[PDB]
Structures are given as structure tokens and as C-alpha cells.
Amino acid sequence: DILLTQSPVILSVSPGERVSFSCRASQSIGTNIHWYQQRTNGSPRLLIKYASESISGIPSRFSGSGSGTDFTLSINSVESEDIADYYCQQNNNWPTTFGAGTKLELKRTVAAPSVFIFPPSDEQLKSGTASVVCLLNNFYPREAKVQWKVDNALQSGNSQESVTEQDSKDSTYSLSSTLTLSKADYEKHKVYACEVTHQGLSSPVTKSFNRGA
Amino acid sequence: QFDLSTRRLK
Amino acid sequence: QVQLKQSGPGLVQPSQSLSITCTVSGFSLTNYGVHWVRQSPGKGLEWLGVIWSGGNTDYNTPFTSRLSINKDNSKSQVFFKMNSLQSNDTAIYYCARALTYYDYEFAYWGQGTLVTVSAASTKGPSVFPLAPSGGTAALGCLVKDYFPEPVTVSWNSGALTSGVHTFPAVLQSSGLYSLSSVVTVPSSSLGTQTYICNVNHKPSNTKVDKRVEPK
Lengths: 213, 10, 215
Description:
The complex is a heterotrimer.
Chain A: E1 4-7, E2 10-13, E3 19-25, E4 33-38, E5 45-49, E6 53-54, E7 62-67, E8 70-75, E9 85-90, E10 97-98, E11 102-106, E12 114-118, H1 122-125, E13 129-139, E14 145-150, E15 153-154, E16 159-163, E17 173-182, H2 183-187, E18 191-197, E19 205-210
Chain B: E1 2-3, E2 8-9
Antiparallel strand pairs in B: 1-2
Chain C: E1 3-6, E2 10-12, E3 18-25, E4 34-40, E5 44-51, E6 57-59, E7 67-72, E8 77-82, E9 91-98, E10 106-109, E11 113-117, E12 126-130, E13 136-146, E14 152-155, E15 164-166, E16 170-171, E17 177-186, E18 196-201, E19 206-211
Parallel strand pairs in C: 2-11
Antiparallel strand pairs in C: 1-3, 3-8, 4-5, 4-9, 5-6, 7-8, 9-10, 9-11, 12-13, 13-17, 14-18, 15-17, 16-17, 18-19
């Protein structure tokens, strides 16, 4: 099988900048290489066929070149909708093989997160479980801290984080931190606070509620 | 490495 | 308009069989060949096989024994069947069509089929409201305790997309998945507008519409 090595693993650029994706073959494959785009939760999308040939509906800002073992996919002016993974595929040799792909991240101005805290619903408390959700919305960069406090007691090990991929429009991230307690534990305490640390904040922001208002 | 949840590379 | 639509996301017991149906439109299966490609954490994109216009089949080397592709030209359906699944067979499976009948540049893809190989049983999720309380209100739904992935979440039957963030599912210690889907709206619309998250967990046929109001 033909081994396709894509470099780098991660690319980080700014909107309007040129960017080049590398794809190297273990041996000469002529120009029998295809490129693909894959956005979040999407299927691969054909960008370029046979090293340089254009594809219908594909923006003119996408082009490709190279021959033999060294190939290059180029975006002359990156837009926020270009945020995706990019794969290369060879078919000069059977069977057709794909590269490991390159992740394209976009840089932008620092954006402070908007913080919202959500108490557990009365509907869930019937199950004997309580989920307290903290929302960090539309921020940049990805790095952020979420510290949970229950009656001034530092919570640890009982929370989980989920982070959205970069937004295709404003290039921001959103984060959700979920504090999970038993209904017994939740009922024994009053003040539930969520402290957020981020570069866009000159001070940690705390959203909190008293159980039962 | 590919993530089945988001169909994106981590 | 050329389209390929695969069957619903599925759970497969260890050492059991996997079956996916690819239904096509916009072209005839007698004119084009249908390929099958999977995507896994450990192996990335991987070409599996193809059934050609004439009915001939090619299977990639490490699948020749347990792979089986069939079709019905009349019903425009392609049948993918792989035997003896193990954990590292857990991946997203695609059916695809090339630009030209003989070639391999995949310009058309199915939406994908997330296959999870596990002995565990299917469980529908519970949906709980994230009730709202600078003129912008945040609200959402808590989709908790389900298996396996995936679950689809929309807002107001697809009419609401602006400001929606559906977070990636996280695996809890219980072995059950959980996610939240949020959306920012004008706080003055909480009295006028109705907000419903449309939750669908096809592996368990659990379909729930959850109305989210201020408590």
C-alpha cells in the first residue's frame, strides 16, 4: 500500500492569509491525487481531482499542484468557512489510500466568554440525580478554566467539559461544564457557583444561584 | 486522531 | 440532483454482522459504481470495497473474507454487509460515488453511518430543560444517559439555527453518553416565542420534543 504523509498535523492561520497543505507519497504516484474537505459532523467533500483539476461548485480560492511524491493543496485567502480537516487520496496504486489529514485552525481577536449558569430542573431531580450546567459562550482562544464551588467547597472530579469546534462564522468556541451530583448531595447545599477564568477577562467571572432562588 | 463524535481530528 | 442516503446509525454486538443500505437517486446504479469507505480513530479514512455497474465486486485486501456487497438496480439500493465485527471496526461508514463510472474520485458521499461495536444494550436518553433566568437570554436542553451515539438535536423543527451550539457528547463513567444543546435568544422573545429542542435517538427510536420555558 502507498503511505501518504500529510504535514503539518495542525495549521493555524489568520483570515485572508495564504495556506498550503502538504501530502507526501511513499513512492511516485504521478499526479493521481485527490483532495478532500471535511467540516464538523460532515462527510468528505471533493476539492481537487488529479493534483490540480478543479471541481464544480468549489470556490476558486482552492487550487492544487505537485507531481511525483510531493503535492500541495493551497488556499490563497482563508475564510472562516474554511475551518475543517483536509485529506489527500492517491489512486495511482491499488488500493486507493488516504492521508491522515491536516487540521486547519483560524486565529482571531481575543473574545471574552459570556457565562450562564443553569440549575438542575425539577424534572431531573425526580431521577435522584442533579446536573448543574455552566455555559461559556462564544470565546477565543480555546483555553479556559471552570471552577465549581458548592457552599465554598472546591468541587473536583465531579465535573465534565465539552467544547464545540471552531465556529464557521465568527471563529469562536463555546464550552459547557456540567457538575454532576446526587439528589441527596444537591439538597444538602445552598450556594452553587461557577467561576470562569479566561484571557479575555481581567478578572474571573462568577455565575451562581441559591437552590430554590 | 479522528473523533467519531464531531467527525473532526483532535 | 445526485444523492446517497444510508440507513440509520447502529449498534453491533461483538463478533456479529453489520448491515447498511445505500439508497441512491439522481442516477442509475447500472451506469455508476458504488464505493464503500470507513473512518475510524485508529485507521482514519479507509477504502473498503466497490460494486460496479455490471455487478462485479472488489474488496480491499484485509476485508476480502468478511465483506459482502450487493445491490438492486430496480430499487436503487446498495447492500453493505460485513461479518465478525470487533471493537476496532467501530467507525463511521460511508457509501460514495465517483465522478465517472470507472474512477475513484469521490464527489458524492452518503451522510455516514456511525457504527458502534459493543456488548452493551441500547438506551434512550432523558431530555431536561436548561431554563433561562445584556438583553440576551441563554437556554437549552440536557440530553442525558443514552447509548450508543449519535443523537440529533434541532430547534423549533429546524427553523432556529442562529446561535445554536450543540456540544460534542461526553462519555460518562456509567458508559452512557450525555450532551447539552444551547441557543441564545433575545430575552424579550421569551414571552412571544416558543422554544423546543427536537431530540432524536434513532438507535432506540426515542423521539422527544422538549419545551424550554423560564422556570
